[PDB]
Design a protein around this ligand. Structure first.
Ligand SMILES: CC[C@H]1N=C(N)N=C(N)N1c1ccc(Cl)cc1
Length: 155
């Protein structure tokens, strides 16, 4: 039904960034075999296509890599995903803002960490978002901060 979802990691103040193992497993299991959409910035920091996913890059500037699909438009990106149940929007503060109005599902990782930056996740007023899932984790040997997975559905 071409549900668009957003998956993000947030620190306090909704601060986001590009460059915690458990969050990588969570990210990987919720995007596996789903087409993913991202900004230049986000593409540039991974370097590799994400395996077994249609990688789609949203940018005004022209393409530099044939392994991934390039688009200049929110609607060009959605159409490039084709007939799939769920589209995963994975990154760009700017890309998250462009796709929140078209999204029904949110996959958030709340990390108990201070981070200095002005890249913030978009305000999602609680009025029309319902929280359906919630999972806290202490810090352990592999994960340096406590963190909490959350999934919200649009009311
Ligand atoms: C640790 C971040 C990772 N984790 C979740 N849960 N969601 C994301 N959006 N992540 C992500 C962030 C930036 C880039 Cl470039 C790629 C992936």
């Amino acid at each position: 039904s071409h549900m668009i979802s957003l998956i993000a990691a947030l620190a306090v103040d909704r601060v986001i960034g590009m460059e915690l193992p458990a969050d990588l497993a969570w990210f990987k299991r919720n995007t596996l075999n789903k087409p993913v959409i991202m900004g230049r910035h986000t593409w540039e920091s991974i370097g590799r296509p994400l395996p077994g996913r249609k990688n789609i890059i949203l940018s005004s500037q022209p393409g530099t890599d044939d392994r991934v699909t390039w688009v200049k438009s929110v609607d060009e990106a959605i159409a490039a995903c084709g007939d799939v149940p769920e589209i995963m929007v994975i990154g760009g503060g700017r890309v998250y803002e462009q796709f929140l109005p078209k999204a029904q599902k949110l996959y958030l990782t709340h990390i108990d960490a201070e981070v200095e930056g002005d890249t913030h996740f978009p305000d999602y007023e609680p009025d029309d978002w319902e929280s359906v899932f919630s999972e806290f984790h202490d810090a352990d040997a592999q994960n340096s901060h406590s963190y909490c997975f959350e999934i919200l559905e649009r009311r």
